[PDB]
């Protein structure tokens, strides 16, 4: 029963438990293999195991489509270290190694247990007879499409090859398809489901974005007496959440231009919150000096361009403030997400300026136009401006800020728990909104 899983998890992979109970629930669903499954867990989640373990409990070959050789390699390497009969069929194989493998697959009782294949190979007619014989002998236990988001023009790593894969699924109707990716907008999931011809009901195992310990809020630069002062106070309030330790933790501030970054470090530091600028303009030595100071807490605050920040990630990041709105909602989630990794309360804040919104809007439009002449028209062109608009929405709506994020990325209603401005004081937000309507 569930008995076998526990065993194979320890005896093979050397694991006492699954990383999360979603990893478990996903894995166990693949194992039943009565329905196709989609796993959208972030990088380092234990996705691989959700098909690697089921592949071995099953009495057949699991084919795993994966979009470049670097990726395949890392896994097939580790899978071998675990003494697992894994084989990549790639174009980095000597024609002799190629042949020896295809020969394996053509035998009854083939050595190979997991087969790592490029989408490229899985399409080529060089592999088709082999593939057919495998299906015909009912030898195919599972079809895994890693990096499934690469079927989607709304996902920004689209691979024309991936479109073949749908046709493939329908041929081996006998066996379950497991689709995996780290991130999917709802539109990408809908594409992934359709273009891979995943059999409804599709079991989904999507890691919620929502993190309790972060407190999101929005302020409007148009309605602020002393911008730089507000910031000072926000930074401070967030720091010294351990008054016994005095000023504990660290924090980040985000800016569009480099001049803004330099200046803001200055203005914050003079106002008494010691801060350094981080941007692509500086030398490599300056970058590592500023980043090193920040890492060791010699400086509590760093000011990074939205173009370039986070040389390395840190745990006690008590606050991430955006002076300027970001390119995309994805971007603000990414950026604000460097906050609070250690799990102790943190504060994320967006400073919203209609003048910012417009200044970015024109730059999006302009380098949308620049690409339409460079290569031409596309579905992704709409998505760029969409991505940004979801963040404008974030600011301009009164409504739970975590639930606004949850909807964008496709998670169900998160339990905010007085956990954002609007959840704590819905009116204050109402009143502040009405205010920017006058100064619009």
């Amino acid at each position, epitope marked *: 029963p569930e008995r076998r899983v526990r065993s194979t998890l320890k005896k093979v992979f050397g694991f006492d438990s699954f990383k999360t109970p979603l990893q478990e629930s996903a894995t166990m669903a693949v194992v039943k293999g009565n329905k196709d499954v989609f796993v959208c867990m972030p990088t380092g989640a234990g996705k691989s195991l959700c098909y690697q373990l089921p592949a071995l409990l099953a009495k057949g070959i699991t084919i795993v489509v994966s979009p470049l050789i670097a990726l395949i390699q890392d896994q097939v390497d580790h899978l071998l270290t675990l003494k697992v009969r894994v084989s990549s069929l790639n174009s980095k194989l000597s024609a002799q190694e190629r042949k020896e493998l295809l020969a394996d697959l053509e035998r009854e009782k083939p050595q190979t247990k997991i087969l790592y294949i490029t989408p490229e190979m899985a399409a080529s007619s060089s592999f088709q007879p082999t593939l057919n014989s495998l299906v015909s002998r009912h030898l195919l236990s599972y079809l895994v499409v890693d990096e499934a988001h690469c079927v989607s023009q709304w996902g920004h790593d689209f691979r024309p090859d991936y479109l073949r894969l749908g046709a493939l699924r329908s041929r081996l109707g006998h066996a379950p398809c497991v689709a995996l990716t780290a991130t999917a907008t709802p539109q990408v999931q809908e594409d992934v489901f359709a273009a891979l011809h995943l059999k409804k009901p599709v079991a989904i195992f999507k890691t919620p974005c929502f993190r309790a310990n972060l407190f999101y809020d929005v302020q409007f630069k148009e309605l602020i007496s002393d911008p730089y002062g507000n910031l000072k106070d926000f930074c401070l309030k967030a720091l010294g959440q351990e008054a016994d330790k005095g000023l504990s933790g660290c924090g980040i501030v985000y800016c569009r231009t480099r001049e803004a970054c330099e200046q803001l470090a200055i203005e914050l530091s003079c106002r008494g919150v010691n801060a350094k600028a981080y941007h692509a303009g500086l030398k490599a030595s300056e970058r590592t000096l500023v980043q090193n100071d920040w890492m060791e807490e010699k400086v509590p605050v760093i000011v990074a361009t939205i173009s370039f920040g986070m040389g390395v990630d840190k745990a006690n990041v008590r606050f991430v403030a955006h002076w300027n709105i970001a390119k995309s909602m994805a971007g603000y989630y990414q950026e604000s997400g460097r906050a609070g990794r250690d799990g102790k309360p943190s504060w994320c804040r967006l400073y919203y300026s209609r003048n910012d919104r417009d200044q970015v809007s024109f730059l999006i439009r302009k380098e949308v136009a620049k690409l339409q002449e460079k290569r031409g028209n596309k579905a992704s062109d709409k998505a760029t401006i969409m991505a940004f608009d979801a963040l404008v929405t974030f600011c301009e709506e009164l409504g739970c800020r975590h639930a606004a994020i949850a909807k964008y990325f496709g998670d*169900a209603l998160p339990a905010c728990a007085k956990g954002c401005d609007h959840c704590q004081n819905p009116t204050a937000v109402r009143r502040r909104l009405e205010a920017l309507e006058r100064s619009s």
Partner: nanobody
Amino acid sequence: QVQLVENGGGCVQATGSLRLSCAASGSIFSINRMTWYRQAPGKEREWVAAITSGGSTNYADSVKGRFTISRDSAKGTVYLQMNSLKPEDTAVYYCEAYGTYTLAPTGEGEYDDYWGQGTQVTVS
């Protein structure tokens, strides 16, 4: 699982009106295509009207002008306002929830098609 429960039907005089609801229960996040099928006794199921996420609506030529479907986005529920009713429009009315994305705050979800129970509609 998900429950599709239709309501708002009954017996009415011709040139009457009704309004049918489809209460879609469960942790529904999105319905790709919510469609109104009607089963008139003695005929083949008829496609009536349908609505995509984003509210793109289309209507059978047999009902255009007279019928309108809508989503109370908040309620998570679709309506078929049927005016200028005719004995022809007598049927059982039911939705298909095509591409019904469900998701718990756990992270545990499903993607599936769901068919509603139906509401009886006679027209004198």
